[PDB]
Symmetry: D2
Subunit: 235 residues, 4 copies
Amino acid sequence: VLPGNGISIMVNGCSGKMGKAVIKAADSAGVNIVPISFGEITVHGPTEREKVLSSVFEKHPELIVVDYTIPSAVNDNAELYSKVGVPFVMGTTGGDRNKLYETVEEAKIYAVISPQMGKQVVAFLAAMEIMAEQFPGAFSGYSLDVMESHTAKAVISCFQELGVSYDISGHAFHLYHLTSPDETVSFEFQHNVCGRSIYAEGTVDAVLFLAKKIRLKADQRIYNMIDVLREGNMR
Amino acid sequence: VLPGNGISIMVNGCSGKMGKAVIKAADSAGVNIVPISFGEITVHGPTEREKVLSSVFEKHPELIVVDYTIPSAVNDNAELYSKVGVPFVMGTTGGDRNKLYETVEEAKIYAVISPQMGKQVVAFLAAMEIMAEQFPGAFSGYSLDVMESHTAKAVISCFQELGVSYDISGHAFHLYHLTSPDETVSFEFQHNVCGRSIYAEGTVDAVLFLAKKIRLKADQRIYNMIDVLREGNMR
Amino acid sequence: VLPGNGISIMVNGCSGKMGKAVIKAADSAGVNIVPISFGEITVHGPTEREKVLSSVFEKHPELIVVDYTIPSAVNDNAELYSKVGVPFVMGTTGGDRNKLYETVEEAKIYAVISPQMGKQVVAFLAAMEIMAEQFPGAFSGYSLDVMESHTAKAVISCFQELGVSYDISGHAFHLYHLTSPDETVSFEFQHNVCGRSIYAEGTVDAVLFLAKKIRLKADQRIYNMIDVLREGNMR
Amino acid sequence: VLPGNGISIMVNGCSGKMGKAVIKAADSAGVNIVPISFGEITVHGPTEREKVLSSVFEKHPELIVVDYTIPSAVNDNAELYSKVGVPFVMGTTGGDRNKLYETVEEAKIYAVISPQMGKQVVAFLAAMEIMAEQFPGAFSGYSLDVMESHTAKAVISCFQELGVSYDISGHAFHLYHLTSPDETVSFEFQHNVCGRSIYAEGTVDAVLFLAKKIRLKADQRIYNMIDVLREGNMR
């Protein structure tokens, strides 16, 4: 019995390398994928939007849209989902973020919105944010050195809250090096991603997460990746 | 105005390389160090224990003992502090741990007891324990590889709680490597300590922490390093 | 003036993810790519091999074949190149390696044969082999720990020659950790590859290398990646 | 049969933390240590230098001096050894280096002079220098990032010779990170030392090395750590 069993997604972003990875991952999970898309699959022109989508959501009431698109399209693509009344999971970056949440909360529609869908990265982030809030000053006097490439903005925000001083594509690489005042203690965290699979699997995870909240007819309609993580592994 | 200003410690362990590091660190903090010790400083024979110590604690009511000693001496050295009524900070390992806490709670005496006093290591531990409890399963399917040398037992306990599979001297070294199922994501944590300075500074930290709880006449008498970390930097 | 300027390759392996990366890299270098292939490009059936290829090599005398194929095809695909008399660069693994060199040396034909074409990896290898031969025993008594994933067989051969004790897809990851006897010294080497671009660029490098040896009418006909590295950067 | 068996050293630097580590290491190797010293052991005033030392070197013809001292004392302490005619191993930094070699080559006296005595560090250096000279340009276009603390000047000299772009106490730490142009390949070297034991053991190694060259009545009188490494492990 697959866990995606009984769930359908529409993947608006079918051509992007991200969209593909999502398709691959959803297919593994047993999530069925409807063969229509927007701006094997039949892609659709950017007119007649409501009617194509309303009639899919009518034919597939278990449908959840996945949106991985363009910052200019966010506020537009969200105004569409809310008028049709279909839940969605959106990891796209950009747009009037305040207007985008406004749109969805007036619609009382169900959604997961997180510009970052690598759920393992989020967890490490959240730990280092809990640590910074629970144990203020614990690393007072330590220095931080960073190497990166082409997210780490919160990480430095935490280490400052912890008392430290400091000055989607293929690969990503992050290295953070904590040194003690007398330089006799070093901590080092290092992070390598090759591909977008980690983001796919987290998108699928939000999907499965969000199907459950719909089914349970939950009162909160809008969720983030931390919400997803707290539910536990649904796989 | 130093923060150790107004605080005195007796360092039972004056000859151990640890004891020295504590002395060095306490001296930096402005903590005054009484020149008597047990089993520059005048070391004392293991008889007449109560009287030597009672008359120091009478002469120095702001005294806090620091104990870094032998596992066989723990339950004995604690029964002494409680009869004199002097607060202590004990990082020694071993002994009947249940009998040792029993001894101190009957005395209603003030103490910090943590076999691990590198407070930065504790914080990382606590983050990874919060993460494991808040986000069950977040790393389901990841494999863990470990390299070590001559603590990491909880770390593997967490990563199992997070869904992962797996098979005091001079230096210490720990490396932990998390790999994703498709092996396209890696996290790596690495940890090097050279010396005992990190433990000294944390012992001093518990001391300053514990002076405050005494002064404030706090109701809880027995604390651990997590308690110390939650107070914030006192330096 | 591109450095691939004036050079043509045929890429037998046009469909493999490796073959693609080679095409991408050769295109950057200015290497022209003929649109025929074997077992945009027109792929050809596995019969009439000599005639198709003889007439390309007649039409394109500056042609160099690149072969990234199947171990069963090595000894066969090499017997073809030698009868036509066309230089090739082959990174495929497998086959009767002794029979494969026999085939080419009787033909007195020009070739680069290296199952490993990431030239940067080869260099590190060669350094650690020079070190092992020049400085026998230099790491006598050090221990070696290794983490890997899905090459490192020589690396351990070296470190044994240096006195140490020990027990093509998307990503690759290698970590090697040298620890001193008293465990107060650690060296750590770490190696991450995401993609096949590094192998492409080295294949192209052998190509440019081999065009020069042909042009200069050099007496040695068969080369490896070390030969390529000693020539210097040709880019 | 210890390998230091039959060899005696005088350790001018008996009080420095380095000198101690050397003593510890020489004692392990079976090297006998004479109980006189300069500027258990009896330390000597800085006058009557020649006579004290001439009469030790007369009483102990197998003596080899080890010098770990002050830059101002180098040129002076070397002029002393040469007039007495006693071999020495000197890792001290500073002084007129040209005048210091001049002094020793006129004396035709036997010596090892290397400001760096961690022989394992030297080996890695020499490999990366062989690599830079044998394979010019091999890392053309790679970027280099460096983290350090309180040597690496040659390392960057090599990586520039390899085509890369770039902008004695307790602990030491070095991390070097090589990234490919498309950022899909990373190499990382990392280096941690805690203590001076690694330098001691290399000093002892030069000593044993130098006893052999004396015994064999070798024609070259002045050696470096590379010479020591090429002999092989003498332990």
